Amino acid sequence: LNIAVMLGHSHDVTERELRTLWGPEQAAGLPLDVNVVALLMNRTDPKSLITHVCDLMSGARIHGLVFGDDTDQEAVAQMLDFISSHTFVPILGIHGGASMIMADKDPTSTFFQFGASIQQQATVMLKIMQDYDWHVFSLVTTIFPGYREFISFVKTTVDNSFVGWDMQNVITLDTSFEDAKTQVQLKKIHSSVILLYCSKDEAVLILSEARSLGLTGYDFFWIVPSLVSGNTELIPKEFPSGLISVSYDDWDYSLEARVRDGIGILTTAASSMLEKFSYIPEAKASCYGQMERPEVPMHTLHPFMVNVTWDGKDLSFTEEGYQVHPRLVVIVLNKDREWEKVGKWENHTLSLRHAVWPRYKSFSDCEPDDNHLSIVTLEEAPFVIVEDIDPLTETCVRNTVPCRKFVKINNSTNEGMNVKKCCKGFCIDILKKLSRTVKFTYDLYLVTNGKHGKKVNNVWNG
Amino acid sequence: DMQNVITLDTSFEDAKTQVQLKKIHSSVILLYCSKDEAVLILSEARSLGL
Amino acid sequence: KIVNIGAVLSTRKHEQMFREAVNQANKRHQLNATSVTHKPNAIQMALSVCEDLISSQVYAILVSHPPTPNDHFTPTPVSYTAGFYRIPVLGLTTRMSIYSDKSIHLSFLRTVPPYSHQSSVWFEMMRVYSWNHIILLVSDDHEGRAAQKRLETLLEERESKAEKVLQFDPGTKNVTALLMEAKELEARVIILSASEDDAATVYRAAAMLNMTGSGYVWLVGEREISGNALRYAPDGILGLQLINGKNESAHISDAVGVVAQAVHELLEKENITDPPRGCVGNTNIWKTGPLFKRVLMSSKYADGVTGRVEFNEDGDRKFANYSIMNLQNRKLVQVGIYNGTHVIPNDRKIIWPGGETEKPRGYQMSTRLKIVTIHQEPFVYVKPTLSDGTCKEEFTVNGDPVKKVICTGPNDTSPGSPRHTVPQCCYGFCIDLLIKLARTMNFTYEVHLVADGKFGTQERVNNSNKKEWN
Numbered sequence: 018l019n020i021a022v023m024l025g026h027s028h029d030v031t032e033r034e035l036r037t038l039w040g041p042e043q044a045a046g047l048p049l050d051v052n053v054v055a056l057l058m059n060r061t062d063p064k065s066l067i068t069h070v071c072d073l074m075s076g077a078r079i080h081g082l083v084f085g086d087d088t089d090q091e092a093v094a095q096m097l098d099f100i101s102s103h104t105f106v107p108i109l110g111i112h113g114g115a116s117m118i119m120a121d122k123d124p125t126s127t128f129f130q131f132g133a134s135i136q137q138q139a140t141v142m143l144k145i146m147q148d149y150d151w152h153v154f155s156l157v158t159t160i161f162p163g164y165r166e167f168i169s170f171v172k173t174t175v176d177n178s179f180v181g182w183d184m185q186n187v188i189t190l191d192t193s194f195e196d197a198k199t200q201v202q203l204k205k206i207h208s209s210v211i212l213l214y215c216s217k218d219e220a221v222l223i224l225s226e227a228r229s230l231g232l233t234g235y236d237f238f239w240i241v242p243s244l245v246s247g248n249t250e251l252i253p254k255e256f257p258s259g260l261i262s263v264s265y266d267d268w269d270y271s272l273e274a275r276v277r278d279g280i281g282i283l284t285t286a287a288s289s290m291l292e293k294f295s296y297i298p299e300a301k302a303s304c305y306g307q308m309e310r311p312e313v314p315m316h317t318l319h320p321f322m323v324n325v326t327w328d329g330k331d332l333s334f335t336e337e338g339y340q341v342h343p344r345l346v347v348i349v350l351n352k353d354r355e356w357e358k359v360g361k362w363e364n365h366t367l368s369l370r371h372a373v374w375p376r377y378k379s380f381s382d383c384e385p386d387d388n389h390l391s392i393v394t395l396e397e398a399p400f401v402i403v404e405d406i407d408p409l410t411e412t413c414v415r416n417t418v419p420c421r422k423f424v425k426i427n428n429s430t431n432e433g434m435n436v437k438k439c440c441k442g443f444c445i446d447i448l449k450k451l452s453r454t455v456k457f458t459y460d461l462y463l464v465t466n467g468k469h470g471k472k473v474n475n476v477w478n479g
Numbered sequence: 480d481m482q483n484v485i486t487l488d489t490s491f492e493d494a495k496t497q498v499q500l501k502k503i504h505s506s507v508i509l510l511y512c513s514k515d516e517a518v519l520i521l522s523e524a525r526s527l528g529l
Numbered sequence: 530k531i532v533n534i535g536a537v538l539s540t541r542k543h544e545q546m547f548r549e550a551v552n553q554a555n556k557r558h559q560l561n562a563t564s565v566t567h568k569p570n571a572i573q574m575a576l577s578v579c580e581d582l583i584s585s586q587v588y589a590i591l592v593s594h595p596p597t598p599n600d601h602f603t604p605t606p607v608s609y610t611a612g613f614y615r616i617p618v619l620g621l622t623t624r625m626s627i628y629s630d631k632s633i634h635l636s637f638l639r640t641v642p643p644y645s646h647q648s649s650v651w652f653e654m655m656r657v658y659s660w661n662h663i664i665l666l667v668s669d670d671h672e673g674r675a676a677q678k679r680l681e682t683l684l685e686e687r688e689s690k691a692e693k694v695l696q697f698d699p700g701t702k703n704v705t706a707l708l709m710e711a712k713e714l715e716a717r718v719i720i721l722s723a724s725e726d727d728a729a730t731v732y733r734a735a736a737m738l739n740m741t742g743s744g745y746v747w748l749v750g751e752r753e754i755s756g757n758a759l760r761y762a763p764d765g766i767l768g769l770q771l772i773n774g775k776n777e778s779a780h781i782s783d784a785v786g787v788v789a790q791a792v793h794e795l796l797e798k799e800n801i802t803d804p805p806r807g808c809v810g811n812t813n814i815w816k817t818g819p820l821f822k823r824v825l826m827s828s829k830y831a832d833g834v835t836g837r838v839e840f841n842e843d844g845d846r847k848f849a850n851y852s853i854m855n856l857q858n859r860k861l862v863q864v865g866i867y868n869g870t871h872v873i874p875n876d877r878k879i880i881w882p883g884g885e886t887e888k889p890r891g892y893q894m895s896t897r898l899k900i901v902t903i904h905q906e907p908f909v910y911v912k913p914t915l916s917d918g919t920c921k922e923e924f925t926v927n928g929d930p931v932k933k934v935i936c937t938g939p940n941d942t943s944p945g946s947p948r949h950t951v952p953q954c955c956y957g958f959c960i961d962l963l964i965k966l967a968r969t970m971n972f973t974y975e976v977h978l979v980a981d982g983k984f985g986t987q988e989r990v991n992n993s994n995k996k997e998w999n
């Protein structure tokens with residue numbers, strides 16, 4: 018019946034009064050009427066945050082809380098988790114630091130976040146690799162909290178996939194900037210895709226050493242987690258161009274949407290609890306109640322949180338505590354050195370924007386591509402025949418080649434989408450053999466403007 | 480079968496020399512260098528797996 | 530030249546002892562000290578910590594487990610508040626593995642090994658005693674998960690894997706359904722990892738199932754032999770204990786010496802920023818905090834009371850002395866001492882459960898060999914049996930009898946049917962070969978068909994990318 022929404026009023030200038038007016042007055046006709054108490058925090062100091070949350074728990078008897086700050090500090094999530102565990106109030110961090118997800122939360126705690134766990138980042142990484150036929154890669158990690166979990170999850174997903182990846186050496190830099198074992202370990206990377214996993218500060222040194230070693234170029238693609246691109250406004254000079262990364266959606270689905278989704282989630286959970294339990298939950302009298310030991314005789318809100326539907330989208334939460342359907346937009350360091358979206362995580366699909374890799378150029382001193390070629394083809398004769406990707410292990414499996422066509426969207430719509438297909442045949446085998454012998458790389462694509470070719474009005478076609 | 484001939488004028492600690500020396504997939508190498516440069520080339524190759 | 534330090538202790542007497550110890554450390558080689566006792570309310574306790582130590586601009590917080598036996602009572606609020614400013618806290622007598630995850634606790638160095646590190650000791654006990662097939666009972670907590678992960682990642686190096694890993698739920702009083710599964714295994718050595726109550730429950734459940742008899746060996750963690758478990762533990766438990774693990778005094782002295790050494794090393798370095806004077810109104814990471822934590826995690830203190838104090842990468846003490854303990858006549862008895870990468874036994878006798886004085890290998894040969902078999906025409910005929918219980922007795926053309934087996938399979942071959950595990954009679958080529966093998970291989974076969982009725986390929990799991998065998 019009472020929902021508290023707390024911001025840091027730093028990245029939210031207009032939301033000082035906009036949060037108060039934006040409520041579920043017309044969003045939905047929920048069976049329980051809730052009032053939104055909007056607060057702005059000058060600073061997210063630990064003692065100050067403790068006092069503010071305790072006052073909000075005492076005054077107005079809030080049944081929940083939505084927290085989002087502009088601080089990049091990661092301890093805010095921990096503090097929020099601890100407060101939720103002790104005070105017994107559901108707390109969600111919509112933006113900033115609270116966004117970051119802790120590996121393990123206390124079982125008593127009822128803390129939920131909108132971020133994406135490292136498992137989801139790894140799985141979208143592997144989806145990116147699958148959608149671009151990057152089946153050879155060399156995972157490398159530094160000594161950072163959570164590296165073991167990331168490595169184990171990557172190895173397990175490698176071992177339990179029908180795609181069949183050639184996962185090579187998995188290097189662990191025991192000491193950054195050592196330049197004794199790091200160099201000899203990195204020199205073994207003959208692959209074309211590298212899953213760097215390091216801190217923002219250590220990744221700069223790692224990438225600089227890689228450039229000073231020959232691991233940066235056209236044939237090398239670095240896929241990188243969000244924690245290395247946490248601040249998209251600070252791009253170090255050592256970051257190579259066209260470096261793939263996966264993060265949350267900074268651009269779309271902002272505050273005006275994050276806080277709406279959080280309030281809707283809390284209201285739906287409360288409605289589900291009311292449907293299951295006739296009595297409404299009662300907030301704790303005070304956090305400073307050392308003398309009286311409290312409890313939760315009524316069932317907590319995790320089950321309600323799980324099966325939650327709001328405004329069409331399914332904002333459910335996993336049993337562990339991660340969002341079932343995160344945003345997880347894929348970004349790439351553009352040639353102008355500015356992160357840009359090249360795919361937004363879908364329901365359960367990559368939904369990549371570039372059907373054919375852009376082949377982004379790294380630092381301006383790199384050589385031009387004298388081996389990569391673009392080849393045009395017609396899928397009419399039995400020498401070149403197209404075929405859809407196989408259902409199991411969706412890819413070009415045995416003798417086919419990635420082969421993109423330009424299919425017009427709908428029938429009358431002028432929009433055209435580059436779909437990736439697997440085209441094979443006699444000429445495709447000739448091309449494969451030629452590539453093997455002449456030692457070049459190709460980017461096959463079918464022609465759209467007509468047949469093999471005819472001189473029309475002194476302009477060549479096909 | 481003679482292939483992947485390599486000639487490096489970019490020294491030994493640079494990146495061009497590393498990327499060019501990585502191309503040697505053969506098991507036999509016909510090195511030709513000065514005595515002073517040979518030790519550096521062999522040290523770079525040892526730190527690379529050749 | 531004042532360098533402050535903070536500490537949260539269990540009682541005022543320990544606070545006075547800590548003040549005396551820090552004074553002795555200062556006299557050995559300009560350094561202040563403050564203390565504050567624990568508080569019941571975690572939120573109020575953290576607020577007091579924040580407003581007392583942080584207002585005094587401490588450099589490190591010595592935190593120790595309280596007298597009351599409550600998990601995560603002392604460290605979690607102090608650890609969170611200090612890690613907000615990246616102030617490195619020093620745990621003293623908290624062995625929970627949740628603090629070994631630096632992702633949650635950004636700065637937490639402790640002078641005792643976690644409960645998960647006991648996994649390594651198990652490997653040593655498996656090395657000298659030549660045990661390779663083990664079963665592992667683990668609770669569904671972060672402690673049990675961490676212990677399992679450490680044991681698995683240390684056993685995979687030796688190209689060995691646990692026979693079975695059985696999970697728990699933190700509070701269930703009925704685990705016999707899982708001990709039933711534990712029965713039908715060749716491995717007869719159990720490695721427990723659970724709390725005192727869960728250890729008592731599993732002891733009570735295993736006592737009624739005769740898992741405490743001869744031929745069984747139990748390896749049990751430090752906290753699963755103390756308290757109620759010690760009352761219910763069967764004779765022959767190979768438990769572990771820490772040397773001066775509960776001794777708060779030695780840990781306090783060793784930790785204050787290490788912190789003094791680290792401070793002396795740090796102040797000799799380049800420009801160092803003071804810790805924030807006030808907890809309130811400050812939201813900046815102490816820039817020299819990570820550097821101080823790094824120098825703490827690498828400082829070696831070989832003159833400590835509890836031996837050399839070296840921290841590993843995770844930020845926990847390494848090379849700690851573990852004392853083995855065998856339960857004899859409901860009384861723990863010292864057996865051996867493990868220091869690091871080596872376990873040393875003594876002249877004291879080791880009586881395993883059941884009173885055996887040998888080194889019982891837990892690899893029951895069983896020789897049951899439950900056998901599956903698909904119904905194939907020329908190899909394995911399958912036919913319904915008679916009402917008398919056994920199938921009829923056919924004969925070959927040469928007058929020899931035909932060997933038959935009591936096949937246990939599903940009658941309804943139609944897909945999407947309520948399969949009934951009824952005993953048919955199956956016989957034929959493969960059955961004759963099985964009879965020959967059993968006669969020569971000492972087999973005691975229990976032939977039974979497959980519910981699927983298929984030879985089985987690698988089929989993708991429904992709505993997933995994982996391979997599966999049917």
Ligand SMILES: *[C@@H]1O[C@H](CO)[C@@H](O)[C@H](O)[C@H]1NC(C)=O
Pocket residue numbers: 289324325326
């Ligand atoms: C709960 O889940 C069921 C199916 O699992 C679904 O039909 C129902 O709509 C869900 N309830 C809410 C409130 O979304």
Ligand SMILES: *[C@@H]1O[C@H](CO)[C@@H](O)[C@H](O)[C@H]1NC(C)=O
Pocket residue numbers: 364365
């Ligand atoms: C969304 O995903 C769910 C679960 O994977 C699936 O059942 C549903 O059909 C999907 N819907 C669309 C439109 O893709």
Ligand SMILES: *[C@@H]1O[C@H](CO)[C@@H](O)[C@H](O)[C@H]1NC(C)=O
Pocket residue numbers: 531561562563564
């Ligand atoms: C040393 O710390 C104590 C707190 O126990 C404080 O009262 C005292 O002022 C400090 N010493 C100085 C001279 O700052």
Ligand SMILES: *[C@@H]1O[C@H](CO)[C@@H](O)[C@H](O)[C@H]1NC(C)=O
Pocket residue numbers: 703705706
């Ligand atoms: C629960 O315990 C009873 C007696 O202790 C036992 O008979 C029963 O089998 C147990 N439940 C299961 C699922 O094993």
Ligand SMILES: *[C@@H]1O[C@H](CO)[C@@H](O)[C@H](O)[C@H]1NC(C)=O
Pocket residue numbers: 737738739
């Ligand atoms: C356990 O052993 C006792 C005595 O040896 C016996 O009476 C009992 O039947 C046994 N139970 C099982 C399940 O083997």
Ligand SMILES: *[C@@H]1O[C@H](CO)[C@@H](O)[C@H](O)[C@H]1NC(C)=O
Pocket residue numbers: 773776778779834
């Ligand atoms: C163990 O504790 C006792 C009293 O608590 C103390 O006298 C003794 O010195 C401690 N052990 C060591 C090695 O310091």
Ligand SMILES: *[C@@H]1O[C@H](CO)[C@@H](O)[C@H](O)[C@H]1NC(C)=O
Pocket residue numbers: 835836837848849850866868
């Ligand atoms: C462990 O104990 C042995 C003898 O009991 C001793 O020599 C060694 O120094 C001790 N090590 C530590 C770290 O306490």
Ligand SMILES: *[C@@H]1O[C@H](CO)[C@@H](O)[C@H](O)[C@H]1NC(C)=O
Pocket residue numbers: 866867868869870871873
């Ligand atoms: C201590 O560990 C060493 C190896 O580090 C080992 O050789 C020795 O047996 C151990 N000493 C004792 C008896 O604790």
Ligand SMILES: *[C@@H]1O[C@H](CO)[C@@H](O)[C@H](O)[C@H]1NC(C)=O
Pocket residue numbers: 913940941947948949951
């Ligand atoms: C198979 O046959 C037996 C006896 O002929 C019958 O009792 C049984 O129900 C049958 N199986 C099924 C699944 O009905």
Ligand SMILES: *[C@@H]1O[C@H](CO)[C@@H](O)[C@H](O)[C@H]1NC(C)=O
Pocket residue numbers: 971
């Ligand atoms: C194994 O077979 C031999 C036959 O040589 C027999 O003497 C022995 O009793 C058998 N053992 C078992 C356990 O069946």
